[PDB]
Amino acid sequence: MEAIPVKQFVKHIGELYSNNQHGFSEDFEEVQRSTADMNITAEHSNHPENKHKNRYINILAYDHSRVKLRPLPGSKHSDYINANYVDGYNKAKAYIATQGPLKSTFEDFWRMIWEQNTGIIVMITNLVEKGRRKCDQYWPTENTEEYGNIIVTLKSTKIHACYTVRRFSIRNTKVKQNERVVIQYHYTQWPDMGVPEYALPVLTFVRRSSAARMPETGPVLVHCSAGVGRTGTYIVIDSMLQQIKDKSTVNVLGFLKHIRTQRNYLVQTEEQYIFIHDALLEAILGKET
Numbered sequence: 001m002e003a004i005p006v007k008q009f010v011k012h013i014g015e016l017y018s019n020n021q022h023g024f025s026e027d028f029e030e031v032q033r034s035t036a037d038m039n040i041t042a043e044h045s046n047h048p049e050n051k052h053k054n055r056y057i058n059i060l061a062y063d064h065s066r067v068k069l070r071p072l073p074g075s076k077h078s079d080y081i082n083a084n085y086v087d088g089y090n091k092a093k094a095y096i097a098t099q100g101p102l103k104s105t106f107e108d109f110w111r112m113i114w115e116q117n118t119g120i121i122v123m124i125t126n127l128v129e130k131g132r133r134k135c136d137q138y139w140p141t142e143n144t145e146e147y148g149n150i151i152v153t154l155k156s157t158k159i160h161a162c163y164t165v166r167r168f169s170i171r172n173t174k175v176k177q178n179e180r181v182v183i184q185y186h187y188t189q190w191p192d193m194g195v196p197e198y199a200l201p202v203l204t205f206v207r208r209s210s211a212a213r214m215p216e217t218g219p220v221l222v223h224c225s226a227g228v229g230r231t232g233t234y235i236v237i238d239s240m241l242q243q244i245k246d247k248s249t250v251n252v253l254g255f256l257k258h259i260r261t262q263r264n265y266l267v268q269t270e271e272q273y274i275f276i277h278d279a280l281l282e283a284i285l286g287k288e289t
């Protein structure tokens with residue numbers, strides 16, 4: 001289970017795709033079994049005081065990698081957010097993978113952003129999809145909105161074909177310097193029926209949202225609804241692009257098995273697993289052709 005050279009990768013995708021995606025199925029099964037023989041605790045996630053802070057009952061934040069909110073005078077569980085640090089290529093905690101914030105966790109969400117020096121939000125969901133509530137709107141439709149001590153001001157919006165870029169200016173009321181630029185990359189193209197037919201617009205979304213990262217800011221916050229499926233998909237695509245650039249190799253299976261110890265279910269389906277491969281195929285074939 002070493003890194004596949006970039007030249008042999010598109011060839012490898014053909015193999016994985018053949019015989020009704022048998023190879024893909026084996027790999028994804030191996031990913032699902034990577035969790036086996038591993039008891040990873042998520043005690044804070046399961047605490048009665050924290051249960052209302054979780055979007056889904058079964059989508060937990062592993063204790064060891066969980067993002068801790070600075071404590072608040074009084075409660076003991078005021079440190080909890082359903083979020084985990086996740087590694088990137090050759091960088092620990094390059095991301096914060098989190099759920100789409102609830103109405104009740106808006107203050108927590110925005111406090112985590114401040115405390116972690118987060119400069120980029122990657123939103124991979126629509127608020128409502130196929131008539132179902134996926135994420136609550138945590139940012140202002142226009143101008144300014146207040147979430148605890150974080151005052152959020154919408155500065156500009158660029159609505160592209162498949163994604164929206166919202167430039168915010170954030171401020172802490174308890175801080176006297178107390179102003180920060182936060183950019184949100186929102187992937188908006190979600191079909192009524194079916195699911196992502198093309199990898200090229202997602203690849204463009206990944207490249208642009210990734211290049212917007214500022215040195216040496218905090219981790220890039222990536223969320224969808226549960227913050228596992230599309231979040232995992234983004235993290236792998238982005239990390240593998242970095243690996244390709246640095247050493248012309250790809251390690252999808254190895255990297256995914258590793259991040260799965262950091263947040264439960266990152267890359268939730270075989271379809272998302274296959275999608276990772278298509279995005280990378282597009283990136284490889286795109287170079288020199």
Ligand SMILES: O=C(O)c1ccc(C#CCCO)cc1SCc1ccc(Cl)c(Cl)c1
Nearest residue numbers: 124187195196202229233234271272274275
């Ligand atoms: O919606 C799903 O959960 C989902 C379900 C299936 C597929 C597939 C496939 C081909 C295999 O048949 C992809 C996605 S998500 C695709 C995606 C969109 C936007 C971004 Cl920014 C990223 Cl990173 C990934």
